[PDB]
Design a protein around this ligand. Sequence first.
Ligand SMILES: *[C@@H]1O[C@H](CO)[C@@H](O)[C@H](O)[C@H]1NC(C)=O
Ligand SMILES: *[C@@H]1O[C@H](CO)[C@@H](O)[C@H](O)[C@H]1NC(C)=O
Ligand SMILES: [Ca+2]
Ligand SMILES: [Ca+2]
Ligand SMILES: [Fe+3]
Lengths: 638, 638, 517
Amino acid sequence: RLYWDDLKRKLSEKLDSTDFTSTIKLLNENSYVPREAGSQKDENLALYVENQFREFKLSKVWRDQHFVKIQVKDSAQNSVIIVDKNGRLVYLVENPGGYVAYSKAATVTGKLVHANFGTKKDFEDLYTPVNGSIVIVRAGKITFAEKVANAESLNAIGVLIYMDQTKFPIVNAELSFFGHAHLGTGDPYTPGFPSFNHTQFPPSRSSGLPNIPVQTISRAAAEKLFGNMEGDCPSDWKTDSTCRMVTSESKNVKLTVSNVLKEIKILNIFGVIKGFVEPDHYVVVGAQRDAWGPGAAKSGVGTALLLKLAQMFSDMVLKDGFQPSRSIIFASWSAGDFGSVGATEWLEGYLSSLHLKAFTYINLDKAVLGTSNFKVSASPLLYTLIEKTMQNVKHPVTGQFLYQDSNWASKVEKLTLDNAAFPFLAYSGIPAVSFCFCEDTDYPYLGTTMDTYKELIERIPELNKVARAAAEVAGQFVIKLTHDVELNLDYERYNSQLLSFVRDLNQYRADIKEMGLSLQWLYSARGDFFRATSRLTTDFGNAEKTDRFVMKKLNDRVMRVEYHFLSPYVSPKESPFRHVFWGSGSHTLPALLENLKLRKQNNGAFNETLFRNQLALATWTIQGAANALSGDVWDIDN
Amino acid sequence: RLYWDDLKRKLSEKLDSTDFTSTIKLLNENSYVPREAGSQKDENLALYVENQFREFKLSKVWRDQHFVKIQVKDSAQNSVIIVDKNGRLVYLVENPGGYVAYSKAATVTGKLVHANFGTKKDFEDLYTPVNGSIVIVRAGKITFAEKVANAESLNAIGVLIYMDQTKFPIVNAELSFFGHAHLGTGDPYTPGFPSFNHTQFPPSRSSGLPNIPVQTISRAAAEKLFGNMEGDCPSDWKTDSTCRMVTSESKNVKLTVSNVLKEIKILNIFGVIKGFVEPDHYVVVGAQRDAWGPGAAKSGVGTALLLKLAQMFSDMVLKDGFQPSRSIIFASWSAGDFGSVGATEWLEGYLSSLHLKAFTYINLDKAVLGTSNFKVSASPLLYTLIEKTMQNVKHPVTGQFLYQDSNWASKVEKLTLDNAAFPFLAYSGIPAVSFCFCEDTDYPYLGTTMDTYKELIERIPELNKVARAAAEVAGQFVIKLTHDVELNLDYERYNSQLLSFVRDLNQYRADIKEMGLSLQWLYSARGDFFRATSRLTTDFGNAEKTDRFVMKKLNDRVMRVEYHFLSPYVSPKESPFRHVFWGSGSHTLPALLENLKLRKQNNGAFNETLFRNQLALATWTIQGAANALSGDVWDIDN
Amino acid sequence: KTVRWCAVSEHEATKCQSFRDHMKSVIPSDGPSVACVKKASYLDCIRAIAANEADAVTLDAGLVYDAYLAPNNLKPVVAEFYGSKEDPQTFYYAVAVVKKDSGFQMNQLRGKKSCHTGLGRSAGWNIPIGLLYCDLPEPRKPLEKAVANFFSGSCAPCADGTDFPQLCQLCPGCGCSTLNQYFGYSGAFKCLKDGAGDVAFVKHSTIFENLANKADRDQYELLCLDNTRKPVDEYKDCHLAQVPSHTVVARSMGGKEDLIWELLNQAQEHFGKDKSKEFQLFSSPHGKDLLFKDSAHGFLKVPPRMDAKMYLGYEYVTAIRNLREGTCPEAPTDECKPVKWCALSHHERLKCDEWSVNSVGKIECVSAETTEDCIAKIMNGEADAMSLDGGFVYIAGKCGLVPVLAENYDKSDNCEDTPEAGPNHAVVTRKDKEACVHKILRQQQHLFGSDVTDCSGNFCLFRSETKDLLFRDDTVCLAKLHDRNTYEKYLGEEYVKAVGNLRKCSTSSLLEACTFR
Ligand SMILES: *[C@@H]1O[C@H](CO)[C@@H](O)[C@H](O)[C@H]1NC(C)=O
Ligand SMILES: *[C@@H]1O[C@H](CO)[C@@H](O)[C@H](O)[C@H]1NC(C)=O
Ligand SMILES: [Ca+2]
Ligand SMILES: [Ca+2]
Ligand SMILES: [Fe+3]
């Protein structure tokens, strides 16, 4: 009855009548003015969104409630001071309104060295040893957690995070910001399993957590610190001329953090529209609701786009005549500020129920922050789905199509830990996507008390149009994903990913031959994978599209690809992010190369016994994914 | 066209014309006379079976070849002697023809204490401490590996295994026997992954292996040892009056084992008949081929039943008109003597390809050993399938039906490590079954050089009939499993299993209340599970059996039950046997209770922090299995 | 708006065309209209409503079972009544017709030839086959092959001719089409009168529909359950079993139950019985029993709450499921089928689950949202018992559930021996499970009933976490009712009329459904 083109036009019409700005402003009222996770204002918006889903008259609307542990700054405020070699001396630098969640809260004192961003590369190029001293770094190069993780690796005492003027042109230099240092996602006090009263919350600690104390400080406070430091910072880093390399041997800094934990009641509000052909299969759409500050950009826009997309698809099914093949689930996550907790406790909670039922996740957080360029990071199984949507949706400002860079597939970057889509793709093995109408420089008030609606509407005049353009992109991902029998997942897009891996590894073919090793097996692994998809492609081409039975046996084999790259050799509790390609730790394909890079130098940093196993499991993870993709369990030739 | 009753009668006719005895004898000829794994005689039979499958004209016949490491007794034979307190003294006891694979091969010397069978219960009731001494035990109470594992727990130096006259009425008292001490399955040198040249065989050791040296000795040698020992063995154990409790403080025993490893070429021979409705789903039928000795009972019968069942179903499809709905795979495993290696390397190798495609495994090893009673251990999802087959097949000797014990479901025992079905059910999560026309006392020449065809045909005169009765039972499991649209898996049979668990745990409700714990969550976990199956049952009752689409969405939910009980919290490499109910280690439901039993005594043996997590993950493993079984991801109420 | 209708065969297609043309002469007054879809069988008609091609088609009560099964999902909306318009009947008699002085009796049918209305139909297959399924020689499954061997020659409409040749010995190919000579009530009587079959399983009204002379009807006899024969005119005193009437079915969701009933209530007045001479809804010169059954005398609305499995009833739904699976009930073993308790709230099934475990699996829990919802579950078989108050017992009672235990509150030496009048809370249950409910619950009394205040250490059955979770908290014991008490016998006489009058104004969806048939 209704086709793609009849659906694209029907969506566009709904987008044109939809007022986003009015919605984002209503989410930034006095009653949602304070939005910390688990606060009464957080639950207030939760009830609003829930009641709103029900008002749209969706097929079902439910809620999950978790009791996770977060960290908050108590009556005992933390402080950063400079002290003398014999004892407490000189002067106080700052008291920080903004803290870092998961903080050690242990009073420490030592030399202060500038590690710049805190990148693994940044610590190697430092002429000053960090062994036994406090490091100061600028945020936004690597997730807060990674900054600390990287510092704790070279034995640091503490970590100071500040916002330089170059990367963050903010006027108020006394402004503080928020964030978490937990390397990972979900409640860190219940890793691997959900925070349900059911589990009785047993004593379990996440390996993500870092003993070292972390604190955020304003620009003014770091400037004060540089006054006591010496050594001009390298022009290599685009930074302020205030920047100073190290403290004087006379005076050093003393950080004292005393953050306490707090058990809260987190609420996840859902809603679903059942598909008509295969209701049990669904695509999930989520958006963060809680925010440390006002969060107009951090969650205001997202939750605004979630409510409206839910509305638009509700109106398309009920009134227009839109008949989706697979269900759609709209999710309002909470505790996102602490590491996508709400969403991760959901995944760790019903993992078995969405095993091969959830075939894609679309994230709406931080979709609108700029206006210059369009940015999107996702799983290659969504590349083709994005590329066709890019050359279909027009930029909100310039009348041109979003698809301008032909080789954009190559320019895409991995999903990061702070992103809500990370847990879905790396832990669950559910293709995920996170698009953004980003800017060359990140949003300055992203985690501050200046993330107001006024600030957002001032930096982006045409906020309504960009929000509509945004909602159109996510709206086409769903229409494409649930519309027709064919599933918009391109398994052929992984050939390039593997070719890239093997080629990078081929560069070290001399170190492989030196060891009792041959790389011929990885060649066949990648080769067999290409054959597997090509046979799957021809299988799709040689089948009747209208036959329900033969398309199901092929689409079920397409969905499994995301799952097959999740390593089956690591414990899902200690190393949650199993995905070989986008997860974390040694097993991943990137870790295999990272370990081998140390062999080239002939240093003892290289673990040979480790490499031989990294290679074997990864060689077979790629092969197993290949065999399972084509030829059956007997039609397989090698 | 052809129904169950038309299939049952068509099978029976094929069974009546099939001569088994002639087949088992042809497998016990001079050319297969020696059958150690990886030997030329082993491969000889492999080629025969392969060529035989092809002669049956099956849809496809293939082979997998692994390069696993086993252990063999070299030129340096091991020896057991009694020595003096100052040095080597007295006399030599025996040189053992038969060894224990995976042996430490480290020369040791110490007091010799009788631990009886070697059971965890046996070591607790010993008045003599084992701390720092060699223990001697009688085989057949617990797998060889467990005997050693249990001894290494209470710090033993070595282990001597012998066959007493009471449990093993053998005439030749100088007869030696074979076995492995590896706690686990598959090649121990490639745990978690397959032994394919692909993996490059990296340095990886299985936690199954025990440092302590193990050796088998004949009855005569243990009798000689008892001569030097004192203390009459308790009448509690049905044993010989020769049996002696401990050695004299003057003389102690010295064991010296020097087994070397050997890399071999193992071959798995397969064959498959494709089903007609859903070819991608299959039931697997395997049987061990290799044997340390002649193995007429250990593998002769099995491989004989495998070849014939392959023949009978080949003739039923080709000539009779049998049209199976799902495929059938016949497997001849090798290296079974070393721990179901061949079969485990297959499972660890194509795990992804038989994920939710293999829905049941039927094992043919040691099917015929006695004639008195019928014994079968399996996954409850096969209980109803067995009970209907029991009251359908008639005993070979007495004209009565096999179904005589009504409460036989309760008398069934867990699958053991030495069984080839263990890896399938506990590691893979594939319902498995292992039936036997067993005897009140196990087969005496099971692992000896007296497991000849002559010995077998003498202890069981009517071997042909018992073999046919055997082949009929496994033949009905397949006809039932592939015959019709409904899958013969009874998910309702787990209600009793869970009720049993919760009731046992309810006994300790006083220790649960003493700790900050409530058991109400486990009640609802089991309750929600019952509702889930009951809703699934009614769902089967309220659907058209002839509709392919709605039966597939229900049978796919039935197959998943076996998978859902495999813990998702443990690493599949270190703790392979994940199944909560039939696997190994702490996570399992039995381990939860075993740990709590130590709390009742108020000793420090109880790990409280461990229990709180054993409880939480198991509470949720049962709940997750429940939620995923019914109500969808949104229709779920709690 | 127009409602599409399904037609089977060419003959019913022409009757549909006339149903269209005649209707648009006084239509539309408000909205109603009719359309025609051509299908080969009734199975094609049920599948077409599910794919929105049609909207309604009339089915036999035994064919209603096939319609509500996935993926067809169809619930009866309008049911036709038999007899008169003054005194309507919602159930017709299924009987067995034979020739006079044949010798054959109900028990002696083996070797005999048969004529059936249609595979899966009430009078034709399920009532007649139903009694013979446990007497049939093994194998019992498939059911069709067993009937193909029992009888020598048989004609079963809608039956696979390739798999069961013997089942279409009388009518080759086994047409479900109106066109086949032997199809329907009158079709099996034509298979008998012609001398093809020895017996025909039809409705009591089939003899009048084919033969009008009373002298010609005397040439035929009716079989009785007690292996006797009686006059055809005595259908009430001698018949096989009572079945629910034919009814029109539509989708549960999106089947417009109101747009079809408004059409049918108007099709009966204009072109129904004794109203017009141009078009009749219950008579057609092109064929008999087209669209509707000629024996019908109008239509009646099917309550909203009443679903397919409630329309047919426990007694009949269970007989079809046991007939298709081949399950025959053995003499009661008194083993006691596990009891299925029904919980309402979250707090109820949490105390129930703790009770299920303590009872060693003798009691299990089924959850329902509302109090009326639980009452429905006990009906179809999803639940077995629950505790109810005096008002609800009267509602459940009118459905078919008799109470067996009463909650006493006055403590005495013999609590179970002597029950109290009051009305108190009664534990209603189904007819069959009345025996075990009577025994299993009485075994929990000695195990968790009157106990010392040791509850934290040990489970207590009447103590709740809040207030009245399953049973009332102030209850001492569950009194055994020695007399076979119904809803009327437990509630006295003055209270019975009391709640009847009050339910007159304050009417529920469960009460209008259980008081329908
Ligand atoms: C869950 O546990 C918290 C304490 O962590 C408690 O405050 C709350 O009431 C509990 N809720 C339920 C349903 O058990
Ligand atoms: C596999 O490795 C073994 C040595 O472990 C070697 O003898 C054999 O030739 C190799 N085969 C292949 C195909 O690589
Ligand atoms: Ca968690
Ligand atoms: Ca292995
Ligand atoms: Fe009828």
